[PDB]
Amino acid sequence: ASVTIRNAQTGRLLDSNYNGNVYTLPANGGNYQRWTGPGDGTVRNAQTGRCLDSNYDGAVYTLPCNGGSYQKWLFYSNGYIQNVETGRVLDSNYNGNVYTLPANGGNYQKWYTG
Ligand SMILES: OC[C@H]1O[C@H](O[C@@H]2[C@@H](O[C@H]3[C@@H](O)[C@H](O)[C@@H](CO)O[C@@H]3O)O[C@H](CO)[C@@H](O)[C@@H]2O)[C@@H](O)[C@@H](O)[C@@H]1O
Ligand SMILES: OC[C@H]1O[C@H](O[C@@H]2[C@@H](O[C@H]3[C@@H](O)[C@H](O)[C@@H](CO)O[C@@H]3O)O[C@H](CO)[C@@H](O)[C@@H]2O)[C@@H](O)[C@@H](O)[C@@H]1O
Ligand SMILES: OC[C@H]1O[C@H](O[C@@H]2[C@@H](O[C@H]3[C@@H](O)[C@H](O)[C@@H](CO)O[C@@H]3O)O[C@H](CO)[C@@H](O)[C@@H]2O)[C@@H](O)[C@@H](O)[C@@H]1O
C-alpha cells in the first residue's frame, strides 16, 4: 500500500521525519522513504503518518493531516508533483533539500512514484 518517490535527476528518494522535515536521501529500504495516497489527494509518510505539505514561499514539510488544500498534490503523467493550493511543483537538489518552485521543465522537478 506504499510507494517510493524518486527524483529523476538525482536518484534520491523523498524522505521525512517526526519533526516534519522533508529531504531526499539515497535509498535505504526504510519506511520513512515510503508514502501512501489514500485517495483524498494527500501524500502521507508511511512511518510518521504525517502529510506532505508546502507553502507559497516554497517550503516543504510534513504536518498532521488537516484536510486543507496545501496538503493536496496532483501527480502528472510526466513526473511533476504539484501542490494543489499553490500550483508550485515539488523540486529537490543534490544536497537533498526539498522545496517547491514554479514548473521549469528540469529533471529536478520530475519524480518516479511507485
Ligand atoms: O537511523 C535509524 C533509521 O535509519 C534510516 O533512516 C534514515 C535516517 O536518516 C538519518 C540521516 O541519514 C539523515 O542525514 C537525516 C536526514 O537528512 O536523518 C537522519 O539523521 O533516519 C531518518 C529518520 O530520522 C530517515 O528519514 C532516513 O531514511 C533507515 O535505516 C531507517 O529504517 C532507520 O529506522
Ligand atoms: O492557517 C490557515 C490554513 O491552515 C491549515 O494549513 C496549515 C497552516 O499551518 C500554519 C501552521 O499550523 C504551520 O505550523 C505553519 C508552517 O509549519 O504554517 C501556517 O502558519 O498553513 C500552512 C501554509 O501557511 C499550511 O501548509 C498548513 O497545512 C489548513 O487549515 C489550511 O487549509 C488553511 O488555509
Ligand atoms: O541551476 C540550473 C538549473 O536551473 C533550474 O533548476 C532550478 C535551480 O534552482 C535554484 C534556485 O532557483 C532556487 O532559489 C533554489 C530553492 O529556492 O533552488 C536552486 O538553488 O536549481 C535546482 C537544482 O540545483 C533545481 O531544483 C531548480 O529547479 C533548471 O533549469 C535546471 O534544469 C537547471 O539545471
Side-chain angles (χ1 to χ4, degrees):
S2 71
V3 294
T4 64
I5 303 178
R6 172 185 303 262
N7 189 268
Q9 179 67 36
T10 75
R12 303 168 67 99
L13 286 51
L14 194 68
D15 196 349
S16 69
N17 69 12
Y18 282 99
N19 286 328
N21 281 83
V22 174
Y23 39 85
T24 70
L25 275 172
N28 61 29
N31 212 37
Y32 296 91
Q33 289 183 348
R34 308 199 76 82
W35 301 87
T36 63
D40 55 0
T42 65
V43 177
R44 300 195 189 206
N45 191 266
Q47 177 67 20
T48 74
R50 299 169 68 99
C51 277
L52 189 66
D53 203 343
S54 71
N55 66 16
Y56 277 93
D57 177 51
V60 175
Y61 44 84
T62 72
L63 279 175
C65 299
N66 62 34
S69 52
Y70 291 97
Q71 289 178 359
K72 296 195 175 320
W73 299 84
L74 177 59
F75 288 68
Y76 288 75
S77 64
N78 65 187
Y80 284 119
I81 303 174
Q82 183 180 45
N83 191 266
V84 165
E85 174 56 39
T86 73
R88 304 169 70 89
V89 303
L90 193 68
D91 198 346
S92 70
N93 67 14
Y94 272 104
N95 192 226
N97 304 108
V98 175
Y99 44 82
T100 73
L101 284 172
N104 65 30
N107 284 318
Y108 300 90
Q109 291 179 348
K110 309 297 182 65
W111 305 85
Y112 290 108
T113 301

